[PDB]
């Protein structure tokens, strides 16, 4: 008897998957405990539409990001800071890089998304990765400069 699993189930199968069990098992355990549903045509349709709808919003995020590879990766964020020689008096934070990135070049970003362990404290040419989606890692080139 074909049922659609609603959960991962030890050596039976994975959530969303279509497996074959003895009718007894399905009727008197699986179904009553919410763990699965009959592979009817009508709810086979539905599982298909979910697979379909998830796959839309996923490949639609792997596009919202890839497009944000195009806005960045094709610029340099330039940050003037009061500094002397190479060491800065204050510092450039990710929270700063973001609030910078909005003012010039327009793009809004999430500070917290940016891979910056400790606030930058030296002038120079920095390459900082963004990660707005796993698998879609962005290169943000940031020139921290004096005056």
């Amino acid at each position: 008897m074909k049922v659609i699993l609603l959960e991962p189930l030890e050596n039976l199968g994975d959530v969303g998957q279509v497996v074959d069990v003895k009718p007894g098992y399905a009727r008197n355990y699986l179904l009553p405990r919410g763990l699965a549903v009959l592979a009817t045509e009508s709810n086979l349709k539905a599982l298909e539409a979910r697979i379909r709808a998830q796959a839309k919003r996923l490949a639609e995020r792997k596009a919202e990001a890839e497009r944000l590879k195009e806005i960045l990766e094709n610029l340099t964020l330039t940050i003037p800071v009061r500094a002397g020689e190479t060491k800065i008096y204050g510092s450039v934070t990710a929270k700063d890089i973001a609030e910078a990135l909005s003012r010039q070049h327009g793009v809004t970003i999430d500070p917290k998304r940016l891979a910056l362990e400790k606030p930058i404290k030296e002038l120079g040419e920095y390459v900082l990765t963004y990660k707005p989606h796993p698998e879609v890692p962005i290169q943000l080139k940031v020139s921290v400069v004096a005056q």
Binding site: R27, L31, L38, T40, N43
Partner: protein, 97 residues
């Protein structure tokens, strides 16, 4: 013993025929009927309990239509069934046939 609430299968009467002797097809003289008496063949009725609308509905149904009970439960989702009595749920369920 009795009636399937789903299929309508009822007890039927059948003869029980007792025979003797060797079939012709096996080279025998032929079969002789040594008795015919009436008997009944009952549907294989069993209980299926189902929760529908948080109520426990139970059906007496021939084993062949055990899957038709669950199919009814499915068609039940489109229904405004809560608050009803289990007599009332079963009526709605049944009406879906």
């Amino acid at each position: 013993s009795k009636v399937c609430e789903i299929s309508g299968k009822r007890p039927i009467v059948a003869n029980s025929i007792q025979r003797r002797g060797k079939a012709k097809r096996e080279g025998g003289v032929g079969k002789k009927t040594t008795g015919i008496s009436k008997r009944r063949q009952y549907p294989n009725l069993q209980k299926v309990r189902v929760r529908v609308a948080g109520q426990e509905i139970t059906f007496r149904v021939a084993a062949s239509h055990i899957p038709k009970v669950y199919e009814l439960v499915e068609r039940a989702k489109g229904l405004k069934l809560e608050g009803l009595s289990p007599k009332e749920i079963k009526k709605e369920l049944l009406k879906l046939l």
